[PDB]
Amino acid sequence: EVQLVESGGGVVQPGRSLRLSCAASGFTFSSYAMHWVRQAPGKGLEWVAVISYDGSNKYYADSVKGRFTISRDNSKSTLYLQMNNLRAEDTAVYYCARDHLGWSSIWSAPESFLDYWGQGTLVTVSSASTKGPSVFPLAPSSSGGTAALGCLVKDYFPEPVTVSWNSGALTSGVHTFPAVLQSSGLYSLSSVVTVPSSSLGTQTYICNVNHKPSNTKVDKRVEP
Amino acid sequence: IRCIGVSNRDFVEGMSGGTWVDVVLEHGGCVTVMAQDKPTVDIELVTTTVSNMAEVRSYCYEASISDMASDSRCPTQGEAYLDKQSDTQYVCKRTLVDRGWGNGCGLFGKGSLVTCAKFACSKKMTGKSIQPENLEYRIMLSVHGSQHNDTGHETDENRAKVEITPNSPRAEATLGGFGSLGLDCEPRTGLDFSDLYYLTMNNKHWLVHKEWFHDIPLPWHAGADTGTPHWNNKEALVEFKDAHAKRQTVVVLGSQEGAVHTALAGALEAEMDGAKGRLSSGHLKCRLKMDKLRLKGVSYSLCTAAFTFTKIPAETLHGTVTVEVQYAGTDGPCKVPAQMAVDMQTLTPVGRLITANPVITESTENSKMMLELDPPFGDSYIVIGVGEKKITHHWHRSGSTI
Amino acid sequence: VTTTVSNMAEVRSYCYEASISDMASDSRCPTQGEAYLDKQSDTQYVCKRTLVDRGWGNGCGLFGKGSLVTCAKFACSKKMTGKSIQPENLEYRIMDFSDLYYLTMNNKHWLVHKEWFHDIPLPWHAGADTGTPHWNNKEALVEFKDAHAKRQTVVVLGSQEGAVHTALAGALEAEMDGAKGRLS
Amino acid sequence: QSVLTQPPSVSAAPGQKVTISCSGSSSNIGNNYVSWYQQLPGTAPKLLIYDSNKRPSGIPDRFSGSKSGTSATLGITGLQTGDEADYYCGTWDSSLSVWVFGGGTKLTVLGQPKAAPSVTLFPPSSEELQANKATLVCLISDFYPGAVTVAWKADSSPVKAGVETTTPSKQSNNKYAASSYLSLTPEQWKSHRSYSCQVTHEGSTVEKTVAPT
Lengths: 224, 402, 184, 213
Prior knowledge:
The complex is a heterotetramer, with one copy of chain A (224 residues), two copies of chain B and one copy of chain D (213 residues).
Chain A: E1 4-7, E2 11-12, E3 17-24, E4 34-39, E5 45-51, E6 58-60, E7 68-73, E8 78-84, E9 92-98, H1 108-111, E10 116-117, E11 121-125, E12 134-138, E13 146-156, E14 162-165, E15 174-176, E16 180-181, E17 187-196, E18 206-211, E19 216-221
Parallel strand pairs in A: 2-11
Antiparallel strand pairs in A: 1-3, 3-8, 4-5, 4-9, 5-6, 7-8, 9-10, 9-11, 12-13, 13-17, 14-18, 15-17, 16-17, 18-19
Chain B: E1 9-13, E2 20-24, E3 30-34, E4 41-45, E5 48-51, E6 54-73, E7 90-99, E8 109-129, E9 137-143, E10 159-164, E11 170-174, E12 180-186, E13 196-201, E14 204-209, H1 210-214, E15 220-222, E16 238-240, E17 250-252, H2 257-263, E18 268-273, E19 276-279, E20 285-289, E21 307-315, E22 321-327, E23 334-335, E24 338-341, E25 352-353, E26 359-360, E27 367-374, E28 378-384, E29 391-397
Parallel strand pairs in B: 1-3
Antiparallel strand pairs in B: 2-20, 3-4, 4-9, 5-19, 6-8, 6-15, 7-8, 8-13, 9-10, 11-12, 12-20, 13-14, 14-18, 16-17, 18-19, 21-22, 22-27, 23-26, 24-28, 25-27, 28-29
Chain D: E1 9-12, E2 18-23, H1 26-30, E3 35-39, E4 46-49, E5 63-68, E6 71-76, E7 85-93, E8 98-101, E9 105-109, E10 118-122, H2 126-129, E11 134-143, E12 149-153, E13 158-159, E14 163-165, E15 169-170, E16 176-184, H3 186-191, E17 195-201, E18 204-210
Parallel strand pairs in D: 1-9
Antiparallel strand pairs in D: 2-6, 3-4, 3-7, 5-6, 7-8, 7-9, 10-11, 11-16, 12-13, 12-17, 14-16, 15-16, 17-18
């Protein structure tokens, strides 16, 4: 009936700290080793740390060294992860995970594999007050008969942002891409519309960028 | 160069250019194989380990009872009966007890009495079956003489790890410029695990005989099921005391942990690593295939520079000598001049090397190497290097009948 | 009777037993450039450059691939030589040589096919050994194993004499007497 | 770019067979025990293989594991659409004294015609240039399976610095889209003859290019 339940994660700020916990129920918690493994949004699994059956052995990823501290309470079957001095790139869904071994040996580590997994806990390191976007025009010049022109919605926070074209008069041909989180904590996206090349200089195209967290309502002409 | 510290060490010898040598690998023990015109290799069994064993039977060594109930009946008023009498979670007892006017009955004699108690099992121990699919031996191989006590072998060419199962007793281990070793290890002669159960009691583990396990006087269930299982022979932990007219106190015996601990005084002990078990009782008859093995520098030139001592030559438990030398030359890789002369004028080799055909592998200056020598009895000279800057060191070896 | 070749010009010699020396290893950490050894560009040296996993666990600040390179001075111990036989310095005697070379290896001689000889997988040179020759393709006898933090274990193949010999099974057995060669 | 390297994506028709590799060193995969973990869309990882070739109970025999030298392979046969997932290889590393996962491999079970990515590349706007910043925008849409790798070129050399790229997301019509932004200072954008964006999808590579002048 093995079950692990993560908890203690939320919308924290950088520089500060947090303490994740994991509740185990279905095994002799004080007999198995425990793992912390995090996963950035839409990224790969990154093994964070491991602690042994009694707590005499701890190992950390080189990214979380001197900043994170794994521990455990065998008395109540709980797993603790202590993260201080956080960063943006620590933002991830944090999973705790049961090993198969307790790591009571030299041969333990080479045979180790993560047996049972929890369900995770979102840990977001957000560091920006609300911010309206800066809108720029992506222009075409010279696909045979079609051409694509758009709007760059740069540096905003937080989600979401809505974009129309010619105040809803233009829809078919519009593709608004999902946004990216930059190396600073602000969001940028792009919205494109594909129109006949012939109608470029004979038809006005205006993108309507609406950001509601801040009160930003900016409209832009896109002309070649 | 392992084994030198090990107490239970063997020295298996080769032939002329043979192909097979038989060895026996005991846990904690070690075998030094020295085949003629072959590099000396160390074979040692490092981990017997079991896993995914099928549970056979669990015994209870600490139980509790709650909400007991008794039923009484006067003579000529039939057998006593409770509804909780048929419940398997409840253990019961029938008895006849004296009744009369003095306690509600119309005539003096024997009345029927029954008493039941709810059987819980606080703690239990579990015996598991040891199938060949559960065993996994691990053997370590290390060619004598490398760069420099522990394990960091994945990079070293002189050191290799292999794993063996009863359903896969064959393995090969590459040793870099030394070729490769072969292993055909009989797991039948390993240990008769067909007459052994794996006992688990509160993080403590043992290997027990099947018949002794079957003869344990405790409540028990077979295999295993979720929630609450059906316990057989509950009377091993639940006794009835002295029956009264309308009652009969029921008491659970104390914990039987220490009792079993004592019953297991001589039993084989197992270590615990999560869902894995880790034995230290080792026996493996193995056949070593040796024709794919080779010396590294058969055609190296000798080392012309000076050797020096780094440690002062020590005597092992088996009479051999370990030395550690530092080679200042850069003409590596070359062949190490190392023999033992009883007469320094003729340099006529006496005794033998254990580290067969020692070789410096690095061409960087001030390298290190451990040589093991098998001196003759009495006085002799350990001689290393050549010419003027050679090391001649007086040695003495003691006697027999341990 | 006396079928005899006169003086011959050496085509190409293959090394079949080789040795290494002055073996060295350099390894840099991540964000600290590629590794460098003095004799890396030397022509008498066989080298191997690769990327190894570096981190705190093996003496480095940051996680990631570091550049490792190992170099060993290649030298020949035993080689076989090939010779071209033209119908010019040849002499028949009684009481097709545009497809054949005169192979000589450790005082034993054969006449072998051109293509077979030209496509054997061993280190080789062209011309003649006046000392200090350039050995082409030394990786045929020296391989590099176990990419590792501080080093990389080199392995030299043993003498390929037996393999070469067993290859020359269905081959034309020849013989020599001094500076000439007795045919049949 | 990874300690254990497995291919970013792999695809196969239903009922077929697919294998995913991950390669390492003697210090990890070579000597230690390799384990495989399946991660279905929006779900915690799940143990697929242990001890290099053993299956946990509940895992069907369609899944297989193998190990050779410093590389390990996972084999999925009798493929089903339910198998569509991100697959990870993992093992302890003895040199780095660190447990390591593979880069991940997105397995797609093809249920519709493959679609080449549509690519549009925009140069930095003049308004942005007079905001002293510069940004090239590479837009990738309508491609199946949802897995592309992006690259940025200067004039005849690769570019790695200042590249923020999204991860493929389900289009409204079950295709996928992604975007990649390259950051620059106006001097860099004025220097080079041209900048290029290179999308790679199912072995093919589409390249677009923009010039300042």
